Design a protein around this ligand. Sequence first.
Ligand SMILES: CCCCCCCCCCC(CCCCCCCCCC)(CO[C@H]1O[C@@H](CO)[C@H](O[C@@H]2O[C@@H](CO)[C@H](O)[C@@H](O)[C@@H]2O)[C@@H](O)[C@@H]1O)CO[C@H]1O[C@@H](CO)[C@H](O[C@@H]2O[C@@H](CO)[C@H](O)[C@@H](O)[C@@H]2O)[C@@H](O)[C@H]1O
Lengths: 179, 89
Amino acid sequence: HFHPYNTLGLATQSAMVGLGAGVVAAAARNSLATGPRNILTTFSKSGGVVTIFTGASIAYVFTYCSAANLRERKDGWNHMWAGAATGAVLGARTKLVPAFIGWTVLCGAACGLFGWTGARFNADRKASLEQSPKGFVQEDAHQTFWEVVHRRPLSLTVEQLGEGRGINAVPIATATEAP
Amino acid sequence: TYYFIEITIFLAILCTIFIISAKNPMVSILYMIALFVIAAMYLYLIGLGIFSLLYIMIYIGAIAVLFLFIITLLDINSTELSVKSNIRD
Ligand SMILES: CCCCCCCCCCC(CCCCCCCCCC)(CO[C@H]1O[C@@H](CO)[C@H](O[C@@H]2O[C@@H](CO)[C@H](O)[C@@H](O)[C@@H]2O)[C@@H](O)[C@@H]1O)CO[C@H]1O[C@@H](CO)[C@H](O[C@@H]2O[C@@H](CO)[C@H](O)[C@@H](O)[C@@H]2O)[C@@H](O)[C@H]1O
C-alpha cells in the first residue's frame, strides 16, 4: 500500500536545502553585478532570494506530504495542492489579490500536470512502451496496459462502465427470446 | 626526504595564488613559469624524468616565451587586486 510521510523531517530537510540554495543564489547575484558591492551586501541587496527559496521549499513539501497523508494515497493531486501552495508563496511577493489568485491556480495546474505524468523529468523504465508487453495478446489473458485484443470480456464492460445507459449484462436480443 | 610530494603540492598552491594576484602582468607570468618548474619537479619526483624536460622545453621555452613576447610590445591595462573589487566575489 503506502506508508505515512515524515512531514516534520522532510520539511526540515527542505528548509535546509532551501537555505543552502538561497545562500548560493545570493552569492551568485553578488558576484554577477555592478556597483559598490561588499561582503555583507549579499543579504541586503539580495532582492529577497533566500525568502523565495525557503518559502517555496517549506510550502511545497509541507502541503505535498500533508495532502498525501490526508488522502492516504499517492497520485498527482498532491502535486496539484503543493503547487497551489508554492504559487501562493510566490504570488505573495506580488502584493495584489488577483495576481495572487492567478499565481495560486496556474502554478497548481502546472504542478498538477507535472505530477500526473509521473512527477518525473526523466522516464520510467518498465512503464515505457519499449520495455512492456505490447501488441496482441497471443492467447486469452488479462489484457495489460499497452496491449490490444479483438474482443474484451463483457463482465469487464459491466464492471468498468456500469449497468445503465445502453449497457447490460446480457444483450437486448437474447434477453427477449421466445422460449 | 619523505614529504617531497606534499611540499610540491603546497608550493604549487602558493604559486597559483601568486599568479592570480600580481602587480604587473609579467610578474604574474613569471609566477606561471615558476609553476611549470614546480610541475617538472613533481614529474621527476613521481618517476617521469623524460616528461619534466619535455615540459621545460615546450611549455617554458616556447609557450612562455611567446607569452612574454606578447606582453612586451602590446599595451594591456590592469587593475590591481583591490578589496573593493573582489570581496563581492
Ligand atoms: C494535456 C493532456 C495531458 C495528458 C497527460 C496524461 C498523462 C497521464 C499518464 C498515465 C500513465 C502513462 C500513460 C501515458 C500514455 C500516452 C500519454 C500521451 C502523452 C501524455 C503526455 C503514467 O502513469 C502515471 O500516473 C501518475 C498518477 O496518475 C503516477 O504518479 C505517482 O503516483 C505514485 C507512484 O507510486 C507516487 O507515489 C507519486 O509520487 C506520483 O505522483 C505515476 O506513477 C504513473 O506512472 C500510465 O502508465 C502506467 O499506467 C499503469 C496503470 O495501468 C500501467 O500499469 C501496469 O499495467 C497493468 C498490467 O500490466 C496493471 O493494471 C498495472 O497495475 C500495472 O502497474 C503501467 O504500464 C504504466 O504504463
